[PDB]
Structures are given as structure tokens and as C-alpha cells.
Amino acid sequence: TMNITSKQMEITPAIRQHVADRLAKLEKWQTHLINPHIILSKEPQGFVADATINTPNGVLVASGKHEDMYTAINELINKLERQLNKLQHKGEARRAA
Amino acid sequence: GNKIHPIGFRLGITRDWESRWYAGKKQYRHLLLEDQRIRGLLEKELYSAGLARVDIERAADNVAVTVHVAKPGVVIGRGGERIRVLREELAKLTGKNVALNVQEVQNPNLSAPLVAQRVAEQIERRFAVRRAIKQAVQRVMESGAKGAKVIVSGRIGGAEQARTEWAAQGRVPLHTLRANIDYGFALARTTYGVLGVKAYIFLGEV
Amino acid sequence: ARRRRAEVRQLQPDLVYGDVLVTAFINKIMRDGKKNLAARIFYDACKIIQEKTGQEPLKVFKQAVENVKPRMEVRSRRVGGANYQVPMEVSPRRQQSLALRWLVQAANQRPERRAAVRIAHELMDAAEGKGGAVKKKEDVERMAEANRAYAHYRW
Amino acid sequence: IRIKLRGFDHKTLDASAQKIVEAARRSGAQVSGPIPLPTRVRRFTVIRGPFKHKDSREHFELRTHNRLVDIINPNRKTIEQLMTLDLPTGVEIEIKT
Amino acid sequence: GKGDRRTRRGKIWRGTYGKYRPR
Amino acid sequence: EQYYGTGRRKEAVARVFLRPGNGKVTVNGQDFNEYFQGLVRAVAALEPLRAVDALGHFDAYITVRGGGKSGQIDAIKLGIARALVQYNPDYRAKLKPLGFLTRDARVVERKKYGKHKARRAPQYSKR
Amino acid sequence: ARKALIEKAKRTPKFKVRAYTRCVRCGRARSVYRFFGLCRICLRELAHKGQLPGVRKASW
Amino acid sequence: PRSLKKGVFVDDHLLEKVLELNAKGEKRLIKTWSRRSTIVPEMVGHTIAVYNGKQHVPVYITENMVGHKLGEFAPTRTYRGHG
RNA sequence: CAUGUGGUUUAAUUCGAAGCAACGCGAAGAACCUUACCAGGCCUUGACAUGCUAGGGAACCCGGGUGAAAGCCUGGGGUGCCCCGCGAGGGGAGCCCUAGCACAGGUGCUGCAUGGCCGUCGUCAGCUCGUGCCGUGAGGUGUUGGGUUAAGUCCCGCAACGAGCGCAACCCCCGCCGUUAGUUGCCAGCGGUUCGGCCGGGCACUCUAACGGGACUGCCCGCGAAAGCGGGAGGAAGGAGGGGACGACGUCUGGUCAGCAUGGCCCUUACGGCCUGGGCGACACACGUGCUACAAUGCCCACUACAAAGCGAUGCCACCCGGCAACGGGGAGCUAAUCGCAAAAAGGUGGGCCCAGUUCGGAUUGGGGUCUGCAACCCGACCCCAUGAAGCCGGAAUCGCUAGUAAUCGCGGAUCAGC
Ligand SMILES: [Mg+2]
Ligand SMILES: [Mg+2]
Ligand SMILES: [Mg+2]
Ligand SMILES: [Mg+2]
Ligand SMILES: [Mg+2]
Ligand SMILES: [Mg+2]
Ligand SMILES: [Mg+2]
Ligand SMILES: [Mg+2]
Ligand SMILES: [Mg+2]
Ligand SMILES: [Mg+2]
Ligand SMILES: [Mg+2]
Ligand SMILES: [Mg+2]
Ligand SMILES: [Mg+2]
Ligand SMILES: [Mg+2]
Ligand SMILES: [Mg+2]
Ligand SMILES: [Mg+2]
Ligand SMILES: [Mg+2]
Ligand SMILES: [Mg+2]
Ligand SMILES: [Mg+2]
Ligand SMILES: [Mg+2]
Ligand SMILES: [Mg+2]
Ligand SMILES: [Mg+2]
Ligand SMILES: [Mg+2]
Ligand SMILES: [Mg+2]
Ligand SMILES: [Mg+2]
Ligand SMILES: [Mg+2]
Ligand SMILES: [Mg+2]
Ligand SMILES: [Mg+2]
Ligand SMILES: [Mg+2]
Ligand SMILES: [Mg+2]
Ligand SMILES: [Mg+2]
Ligand SMILES: [Mg+2]
Ligand SMILES: [Mg+2]
Ligand SMILES: [Mg+2]
Ligand SMILES: [Mg+2]
Ligand SMILES: [Mg+2]
Ligand SMILES: [Mg+2]
Ligand SMILES: [Mg+2]
Ligand SMILES: [Mg+2]
Ligand SMILES: [Mg+2]
Ligand SMILES: [Mg+2]
Ligand SMILES: [Mg+2]
Ligand SMILES: [Mg+2]
Ligand SMILES: [Mg+2]
Ligand SMILES: [Mg+2]
Ligand SMILES: [Mg+2]
Ligand SMILES: [Mg+2]
Ligand SMILES: [Mg+2]
Ligand SMILES: [Mg+2]
Ligand SMILES: [Mg+2]
Ligand SMILES: [Mg+2]
Ligand SMILES: [Mg+2]
Ligand SMILES: [Mg+2]
Ligand SMILES: [Mg+2]
Ligand SMILES: [Zn+2]
DSSP states (O other), rough: OOOOEESSSOOOOHHHHHHHHHHHHHHHHHHOEEEEEEEEEEEESSSSEEEEEEEEEEEEEEEESSSSSHHHHHHHHHHHHHHHHHHTTTGGSOOOO | OOOOOTTTTTTTTBBBBBOOOOOOTTTTTHOOOOOOHHHHHHHTTTTTTTTEEEEEEESSSSEEEEEEEETHHHHHOSSSSHHHHHHHHHHHHSSSEOOOOOOOOOGGSSSHHHHHHHHHHHHHHTTTTTHHHHHHHHHHHTTTSSEEEEEEEEEEESSSSSSEEEEEEOOOOTSSSSEEEEEEEEEEEEEEEEEEEEEEEEEOOO | OOOOOOOOEEEEEEETTTTTTHHHHHHHTOOSSOHHHHHHHHHHHHHHHHHHSOOOOOHHHHHHHHHHHOOOEEOEEETEEEEEEOOOOOOHHHHHHHHHHHHHHHHHHHHOHHHHHHHHHHHHHHTTOOOOOHHHHHHHHHHHGGGGGGTTTTT | EEEEESSOOHHHHHHHHHHHHHHHHHHOOOOEEEEEEEEEHHHHHSSSSSSOTTOOOOEEEEEEEEEEEEESSSOOOOOHHHHTOOOOOEEEEEEEO | TOOOSSSSHHHHHHOOOOSSSSO | OOOOOEEETTTTTEEEEEEEEOEEEEEEEHHHHHHHOOTTTGTTGGGGGGTTTTTTEEEEEEEEESSSSSHHHHHHHHHHHHHHHHHHGGGGGTTTTTTSOOOOOOOOOOOOOOHHHOOOOOOOOOO | OHHHHHHHHOOSSSSSSOOOOOOOSOOOOOEETTTTEHHHHHHHHHHHHHHHHSSEEEEO | OOSSSSSOOOSTTTTTHHHHHHHHHOOEEEEOOOTTTBBGGTTTTEEEEOOOSSSSSEEOOOEEEEEEBBGGGGGGOOOOOOO
């Protein structure tokens, strides 16, 4: 199931759960999110939400950066979505000819 | 960080150990240890001589340390004064037959570790770091080397952005084992930190 | 790999029959590199297919081979938007290789207790034309035939 | 009537055996040639970097090669001028009988 | 069983000796 | 009185002593068949003389040391093959196309740092 | 805790077990070779400079 | 365990204190740092204060508790469960 | 089941690594120590540096009280010197004490201030410079192009002609051969042969470790403008002989202030220092690496063979004995081509198990012992009796490996008292 690392930061089970809830957006696609991995970090610049997920047709790797941690967490999601959606439909592009 | 140390890499091919001796299973760790404390003292004082090697020879509770160096007089002393005052200081540490010699160096500008401290020094003198390096390689080629490559790292000129400058000239084939390339490192201090001056002198291939 | 085609490894003929084919079949019985153990079993089996059927183990062996060599097979190849079962003839080389593999495999799928026995029996049934090995062979050939349709999609 | 040679360097262990071979063969009488004894190898393996990076070590060794000579029919014309013998630095010598 | 301390095969593994593997 | 070749294989070396006779063979003072008892690999340790009609015509006193029961076997195959070619230098063809006249240099490749053996890499994971 | 620590190492213990190797060169508590008195980083450094006799890079 | 050839172990600085209390007759709070120490038939009836890392734990001793060490009855880890 | 990690728990569960390139990673040895963490008792020029100044005497060795130890208290026996020394007798300086004062010290922070060292893309075939040339210019040319190669490898072509860092080569191992070398190693033939290459004797052979040789697409044929490619011979090896060492300009504001060095910021009876104890080993859970299995190509007892590289003077320990054994008591050999670790295991002959949650499997637990160690409660490895779990070949997903490889079997070493 799903894992989260808070690198050189202290975070709460609240904050963790929200992150659970956020990755859910991906569930839409109805493919398997296998051992998703979220890593949250603080740069000088603002925070960073990393993610690496294997699904039956490939992996998601992403990085969101923002002054707001939550915003960074979302940007992470925006990138992941895109990747996954392209993962699920790059197939269909070449059906004919 | 990729590159191999070009001296550890020629050891017993084009460059021979800075310590030649055997010592047994039971002694080596202490034997080597003096050689180290010996070199600290020696390099500590003999900086001002411009020393480029400290050899240590041993047989049986006695050692002949050869010092090769740029300006031998500073080591020798007042008409013979320091040299022994050091064999004195020496076997204070050594406690055995500390037989100190000297050697002169024909060209300090064809001895790498020298060229290195020189330009390392210049930067502490608040000098123009691009130009220093430019000249170091420029002097070493006028001094006849087959190749030359000086390399400075760190907050150059004082910058907040750690930068890494270098120039080189002729050939400096670090991949070649038969090529003799002298390498020497000087670590320069400034008010804002450490800059890493590396020197590469290719002298000739056997 | 990419560049030039690989070379067929040459086997050292076995020190009982001197047959190149026999060698391969032993090594297919070989597990963990313990070759002698595997060598034992092949011969063990011949002991059985000599007594249990009164003539040359060897001859029976090469028949079980010709009777498990599959001639046409399918090789999946996506055309357009569907994965097609494409019919193709098995290279001579590969008929052997396969027919070997299936022989042993079919065997280990058996209830008689020593490996020594099964390799005999399977090699017995398959030599005539019966046997779980042939069942794999027979099947592989129907798959080819049924799909005769998609055979201009051969490469 | 025999000498034993232990050092880290081989151009020297060979050169010094070679000369003692020449010392007592000239100076009388019989010398059983410099025998090349099997080298005992002290090896060192060490992780290249200072922190993490487990699978990139550097490989080091310490060859201590052995040498034995015999001066067969002794004749202390030799046994004298061996106290007058020129031995390099990186070799230690052993004599018993 | 390369891990059952109580056999010949086992004391070889665990690099020991006992009743089931004497010297 | 005698014929010799030196046989090698992996870390195994074979000293072969041929002396024409009833064809009988010995390994380290021990009977051939007694030494390789139950190793089918054996009968081609004596193989190269069969490439030259020589089974019973020569005997074999044989020393062997190092390696394993089989590379040893292999080196013997080289060593006896070696000796028949000194005994009879017109034996080049009819031993060399059979390849007996060579010594496969195929030895254990080194265990490397970062791997598990010579080549078996360690198992990793993207996710 | 550094020089305070390298010092506690130098001195003789209140019991015999507490003998622990430090590097003589940098003070490192871990990966310290008996044969040299050095930890593996230091070990590597001098050997590279050449200040380690017989010690060369092994290639095989 | 600890070898039988050697002697069943007490810290000496505790053993004496045990027995200094035998002379006058028990019973004192013996604050201790000695989990290392076996419980001894001479310790029965006493209540030794065993140090677990934070606290000197009041520990009563009886007949059934002789072979064990002093640290067993001042456990060290606090764990009320998970969640 | 072992180990790392996420997490939660906690007095504390020290800290860093973070997709590939963090996760049996720094840790090539956490009971104490280590050890940076917590509780508690302490220390204030201080565990260590260089000093300046007053009181002792220097310098050292030994116990006494309290105390968990640390510490707080402490009873003792003499400073050489050069001095006025016949003596009372004072100075002095290596080295300790006590009090001050400088200062020490900090694994406290910033790898987004840094040197160094490493990972990585990548052993990938690349990255550039000089001058000329083209372009107002960023920049192009060269480095593209035809062919070839493992390759910016070579050929040919060309506004280019050269050159540099890389590729290659020179270094190491294995493969064949010769030279030198003959004990502690080797033993073909003679003699003994105490039945052990044990002795005579020899270096043949085996080996040992040093020095050269050898392979160069050289030869042949064919294809080729050429470089080269296909193929045959000779050879131990043939087209790069198999492996290693070596990693371009740079990239990832990659990793490390906790190896070290280091600018700056920060602590100063404390963010330093010492010690006892606890913690780093926590356990509703999740992940990574792995060990052993689920068995008859298998398991068990017996008997029988064949390695290699290493290590070994508070060390390896033959062999003798007590012991079911771990082990213990004796005790020979060796600074080790001698003496020892030592048995290699798979394997081989034989015998039992007869398809069973078992003669599989070896977790968990009870109980009894061994060793290290000041001490194995937390928390060591090992032996023996008993216990004899999950597990019947593993979903989605997914790792390795192209030959002496994968698979499978054992052996050594580092660190280390033990583990
Ligand atoms: Mg990232
Ligand atoms: Mg899109
Ligand atoms: Mg099948
Ligand atoms: Mg690893
Ligand atoms: Mg069992
Ligand atoms: Mg197994
Ligand atoms: Mg060899
Ligand atoms: Mg047989
Ligand atoms: Mg192997
Ligand atoms: Mg420090
Ligand atoms: Mg220890
Ligand atoms: Mg240590
Ligand atoms: Mg935690
Ligand atoms: Mg930190
Ligand atoms: Mg990794
Ligand atoms: Mg450990
Ligand atoms: Mg601790
Ligand atoms: Mg502590
Ligand atoms: Mg950085
Ligand atoms: Mg960091
Ligand atoms: Mg850096
Ligand atoms: Mg230009
Ligand atoms: Mg234009
Ligand atoms: Mg112009
Ligand atoms: Mg340009
Ligand atoms: Mg380019
Ligand atoms: Mg260009
Ligand atoms: Mg081109
Ligand atoms: Mg290449
Ligand atoms: Mg080129
Ligand atoms: Mg061109
Ligand atoms: Mg010779
Ligand atoms: Mg070719
Ligand atoms: Mg190269
Ligand atoms: Mg960063
Ligand atoms: Mg630091
Ligand atoms: Mg700092
Ligand atoms: Mg300032
Ligand atoms: Mg402590
Ligand atoms: Mg603890
Ligand atoms: Mg840990
Ligand atoms: Mg494991
Ligand atoms: Mg059961
Ligand atoms: Mg059972
Ligand atoms: Mg414990
Ligand atoms: Mg079950
Ligand atoms: Mg079953
Ligand atoms: Mg499976
Ligand atoms: Mg299996
Ligand atoms: Mg699947
Ligand atoms: Mg490959
Ligand atoms: Mg092992
Ligand atoms: Mg060991
Ligand atoms: Mg150990
Ligand atoms: Zn160090």
C-alpha cells in the first residue's frame, strides 16, 4: 500500500492524510497505483513534493516546488496526472494506419 | 568527482614511493606514523624553503630523510646552522638515528607541487585568479614542460557562487601510464574560505 | 543481439553414444549444474526403455524427437490495434531446442516417482506418438493451422 | 649456511639476491641459486567515497615477496666480506644455518 | 536443511560442530 | 622408455606417463577407474589416443594435483594428447582438428565489486 | 565530541574490553585498519600520495 | 548463559550492602544501578530500587525470583500499545 | 527468519542518504566502550593545544574513606643540576600540582557560502581550441558528408589545415612457450623404503616468482579506390584472445560541515567535559535487500575422494585425554612453500525415508549446559533434550544473466574480546 517520507522536516498525521487524499485524484484513471511513494522536503526556496509510482504501463516520476507546501503537493499531482493520462492513451494513437 | 589521482596511479611505473622501506606486520603502523609526524614538522617549517618532496629511508632504528627543495639555503641554515638544529628537533621526535639530508630542485617551475603552492599563494595575496592560472601554465611551458594544466576551485575572487576555473596547454594525457606527469596540490586560505589549487605537469613519456 | 546473428554452440558428443542430440537432452535434464546426476538419469532411463521395450534406447530417443519437433508455430505480432497470432515455420535449430524442452517438461509432469523412470516413459510414449510432450506439440500446430488466415502477415 | 630476503619491492629483492649470489660464488665456494619463494599478499579494499556509495570501492595490495639463497660449502673468506655488503633500503635480510 | 542446526548439512552452514557434526 | 606431456585445465595440471603395454592406466598410484568411479565424464579423459588407434598399445602412469575431478579429467585428455605428438610428430593432423592439441583457457572469471559474482548484479527497484 | 573523544581513546581503559581502534590520522571511530592505524579514507589518501610503502593499486 | 565454572555474579558494592542489612535486620530502600546483578537467596524479602534508565523502580523480591537478574523487574520500555 | 528504511511508540528510540544513482547505504563488527541519544550523579583553565603570572615542589609510585562509577575527601617515599653546597642554606629549568587569566572545546547550523573525495549519465563517442573561411549577429564550418569500426576507429571526400581533452596504446591478472632459480616445494629412473618423497640422490617434471618470447589481419584466397570485411592455413591463443586497472568537457544548485579540512553563524558552570544506567535492538502497520524452504534431479546416517586463495607469536593450534557436545585439561610444531587453521562441499559406493505438512521445513517456546567478557535483564554467539510454525512454488507487478557466464556447492579474509 502507500508510503510517505518527510525529509528533514517534522509533519503531522493530518498533513500525511491530506497527501493520501490528494494522490487519490489519480485513482480516476482506474489503473493500479503500485507502491506509490511521496517524499516531502524543504528547499531554501520553498517545499518539494517528490513522487514515484509504478502502474501496469509504466512509472510516474514527478517534482513540485512551491512557497506553499500544499501548493507544491498539488503541482506534484498536476504533473503525475499528465504523465499517467499519457501513459494510458499513448497506445491508442497509432491504431490506424 | 570522477578522475583518478595521477600519482597513486603511476606508483611503481613512472613515479616511485615517497617512502622506501620494508617493515613487518608488527611495526608498520608505528613506523609509518613517525614518517607522518616527521613530515608534518618538516613540511610545517620547510614551507618557506619551497619543499616538493620528503623522502624517508629506513633500515634498523635509523632513517635518512631526503628533502628535495627549491631554495636549499633556507633549509641548510646560517652557514650550517638550521640543518642540524633540525636533526636536533628531528630525533627529538624520531628518538633514533635521524640522518637529515638535502637535495636541490633544478626548476621549481617543473616541479608540480611547487607551481601549485605558488599560484595558491598568489590568490591569498588577493590576486587576479583567472590571470594567475594563465601565468602558472605560461611559466611552466617557458620552463620547458611537455604539458601543463593548473586548476583552481571555490569562491574565486570571493564570489558567493562557487565557481571552478582552469587553463591548460600542450599535452596532459592522464590516461597514459608511461607518460610522466607531476601532480601537486596546494590548499589556499582566504577570509571567505578554502580554494583548491591543483597542478598538472607532464614532463615526458618513457 | 543487434549486430550479427549468434553462433550455434557445438556440443561434445556423449561418452556412451557420441550423439550431439543426446548431449543437449541431458543438459535439459540438468538442474543446478550437477551434470553427472543428470547424466545418470538419462542413461538410467535407457536402461528402462531397453528392458521395458526390447530394442535400442537411442533409436527410440531420436523418434521421440522427430515426433515432438513442431513444424509450424505462432509468434505474436501486433498489427494495428490488435495482437495477432501469426503462423510461422520453426527453424530447424529451434525444432530441436523446443522438442527437447517439452520432452523433459512433459516428463516432470508425471506421477512415477524417480526422475529416472519418467524420462524413460515420456520418451517412450512420445517416440510412438502418444505423450504429454506431443500434446504440447500437437497443440502448437493446431494454433498455427487455425490461424492460416493471417499468414501474409508472415515476416 | 643460508640467507633469507624479505622486502616490499621486487626490482630490489631480486637485485640484492643477485649480488649476494655474486658475492659468495666469486668468493668461495658453492651457492644454491636465489630461490623465488611464493609471495604472501596482504590486500586492502575500501569504499572510494567518504559517505554512502557502497558499490564503488578501491582495490589496494601489499606484495611481500620472498627470496632464499644458500652458500653451500661455506668458507669464511666469504663470511668475512658479507659484513662488507651493500643492501638497498626497501629490503630486510635474515641469516641462520 | 541448511538452517536446521540439528544436522550434518546444517553445522556446515552455521559454521560449527556438535553431536551431529563432530571433528 | 617413456612419453610425457603436460596437461592443464582451470587450476588443474596433468602429468602423463605413457609406457607401451597392455593399455592399462593409473592416477596417483591409484587405478584409473577406481579414481573416477561413477563419473561418466571419465572415458574421454583417455580419449585422444582413440583419435590415433592407440587404446591398448600404451599404458599410463599419471600424476594429477589441483582443481577438480573433471578439469583434472580434461587436463589428462590434454596431457596424453600432448605426449603422443612428441612420440610421433606425424600426429599433428588427426588430433588437432579434433582440437585435442589445445588447452581451453576458459577459467573462472573474477568476482567484481558491486556485483554478487562475476556477473550477477544485485536486485534493485525503480518503485 | 571530537578531540575529547580521540583523547579518551589514546588513554588506557578502566577495563580491558574498551580498547577501540581510532584512526591515528583523523580520529575516525569506524572502519579502522589494525595494520596501518588508519581508517579507510585516510588509508586511501596516503596510499595515493605514495606515503604507503609496498601499497599500490591492485589490478587483477 | 554466564559460565558455571565462574561464580554466580553480584556487583560487590551491592552484595555488601545486602548483608550490612542482615546484621541489623532488614529492610531498606536500596537504590541501585545494578541490573547486572543476580538476585540472591540473601535478597529475598528486600525491596531494592532498580534503575531502568530514568527511575529507581521499587521492586519487591520473593522465593520464585532467584536465578534472574536485577533488570528484569524494572523493565525499560514504555509501551501502552499502538494507536 | 535475517537486515535497512517508512512510520507509529518513547524519557530517549542519535544523525545523515531520498526514483533510476536513498533503503544488508556511511556502519570492514552498537551489551559497556563505541555513541553524536535520554534519565540521573558530577567537572569549570577543563579530556587535549600554546601561553603569560603567584603558592607547592617539581618531575614520580602506593594504598585510605565515601560513592554506581565519575567525583568530593586523601595516608604516604626522593627533583636531578650548576650553585655558597664541609653546613644552616636560597635560586633555577625540562615534568607534575594548586589559583588566575588568555584561550580550549562543540558529531551545535548552513553540502544554498566551501576544498577534497565519491555517485551519475557513461566506457556512452563524445566535448573543444587555434588560425583561416561564412554570417550585421547569436553562431556555422572544422566535428557534416560516402564507407568502416569497439570507438571523433581508420579510409576516401571537402574552406578548411592543424591541435587538445577523451577512444586506443603503454600498467596488472589468466592463456602458451623459453631463460634464470632448487628449499620449506617437486619425484621420472637407481639404491635403500623404519612402510611417511621417510633417507640417499637428483631440478627432469610439478611448482614457485622474476625476466623475455609470442598475434601483427602478418600469410593465402576473394571482395575492396582505400580503410577494412568474408573465409582457409600455421598456432597455445586470430581479428579487441578472456577479465581487470583506467571514466572526456560537463550534468544532476547530485552526496558528505558526521572522515577531514573549511568561511560565516551560533553555545561558554555549557550546545563543552566525565561517569553509571537506559536508548540506538521500541512494534497496530507499510516498503527495499536478502537467508532457508515448500522437497524423491530430494532428506538423513556411514563410509570414499578433487580445489583455490588467504590468515595465523596475550596467534594459528597438531595429537593425547574428560565430555552426547559446545567445550575444558594437558601438550608438540611454526617469526611459517616447513608447523596449523583444514573438514573443502557439491561430488562417489552404500544403506534408510516412499509422496505424507512427512525422516519435508526449521520458526517459535520450555529446560539444561559451553565460551568471550569487569558485566550477556534489557541484548551476545554456540551445544544438547524437548517443542516442530508458517509454508504444497507465490496477485498486480518485477530483478539478473550472452560461457566457464547464469544456476548450484563449499572455502578464506577484512573489521573483531565476542557477535
Ligand atoms: Mg529529484
Ligand atoms: Mg499531454
Ligand atoms: Mg509443456
Ligand atoms: Mg550492496
Ligand atoms: Mg529436518
Ligand atoms: Mg539448497
Ligand atoms: Mg599460476
Ligand atoms: Mg565410472
Ligand atoms: Mg564462483
Ligand atoms: Mg574536529
Ligand atoms: Mg571491542
Ligand atoms: Mg574501530
Ligand atoms: Mg524515528
Ligand atoms: Mg547534519
Ligand atoms: Mg542504490
Ligand atoms: Mg553489525
Ligand atoms: Mg552505548
Ligand atoms: Mg556515553
Ligand atoms: Mg554541492
Ligand atoms: Mg543534505
Ligand atoms: Mg563539493
Ligand atoms: Mg573558428
Ligand atoms: Mg543568416
Ligand atoms: Mg566578419
Ligand atoms: Mg563558433
Ligand atoms: Mg561534436
Ligand atoms: Mg559544431
Ligand atoms: Mg562521417
Ligand atoms: Mg568504445
Ligand atoms: Mg582520434
Ligand atoms: Mg572531415
Ligand atoms: Mg630449469
Ligand atoms: Mg576482420
Ligand atoms: Mg584506455
Ligand atoms: Mg542540494
Ligand atoms: Mg566537521
Ligand atoms: Mg563550519
Ligand atoms: Mg568578519
Ligand atoms: Mg555511557
Ligand atoms: Mg544500551
Ligand atoms: Mg541502526
Ligand atoms: Mg538476509
Ligand atoms: Mg507438523
Ligand atoms: Mg518432520
Ligand atoms: Mg546481551
Ligand atoms: Mg498450511
Ligand atoms: Mg507433497
Ligand atoms: Mg518461482
Ligand atoms: Mg526451487
Ligand atoms: Mg506478471
Ligand atoms: Mg553482454
Ligand atoms: Mg564463507
Ligand atoms: Mg579471520
Ligand atoms: Mg571475529
Ligand atoms: Zn582517518
